[PDB]
Design a protein around this ligand. Sequence first.
Ligand SMILES: Nc1nc2c(ncn2[C@@H]2O[C@H](COP(=O)(O)OP(=O)(O)O)[C@@H](O)[C@H]2O)c(=O)[nH]1
Ligand SMILES: [Mg+2]
Length: 168
Amino acid sequence: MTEYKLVVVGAVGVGKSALTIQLIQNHFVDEYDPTIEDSYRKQVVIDGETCLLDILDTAGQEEYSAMRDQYMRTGEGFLCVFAINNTKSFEDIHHYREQIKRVKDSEDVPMVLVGNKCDLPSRTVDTKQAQDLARSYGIPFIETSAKTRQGVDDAFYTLVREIRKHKE
Ligand SMILES: Nc1nc2c(ncn2[C@@H]2O[C@H](COP(=O)(O)OP(=O)(O)O)[C@@H](O)[C@H]2O)c(=O)[nH]1
Ligand SMILES: [Mg+2]
């Protein structure tokens, strides 16, 4: 009875809470308190198989809990999110990739790079840039929009699929 513990990381404002709520609840949140760091559960059929997704949506806050601990420790895969209209959130990606390696003492962590807000026309990080970054970490790269649902399931299920490869 497989449950996958997914962790969503990235700079503030990139859409980590919106992606999670799109996937779990199928609507787009226009605002969501940046300090709310919860987990969200759902049962989905991925590639024809049912599973339990436990998704911790991080909020980088000096307030405390065990879930943000009990999960960054043994979350099995991480979504690293930036926004395609937010160069600074792309420049921070390497900070978050390094954090994950430290918290799991491994450079073999299941991981997907997500470029969110692809519905927005004022783009400053282009697809090639992001692809090159992903190809240098060894990881898939997925373009999403929490507003339109584009790529949203694909981000999360590719990560689940990477966790599957890793188990072997
Ligand atoms: N246009 C557009 N806006 C988005 C998208 N995803 C998130 N947003 C908006 O970006 C802002 C920050 O989103 P949020 O989920 O709170 O980011 P977080 O800080 O990573 O949790 C919110 O106002 C969202 O409505 C998207 O795919 N497209
Ligand atoms: Mg948030």
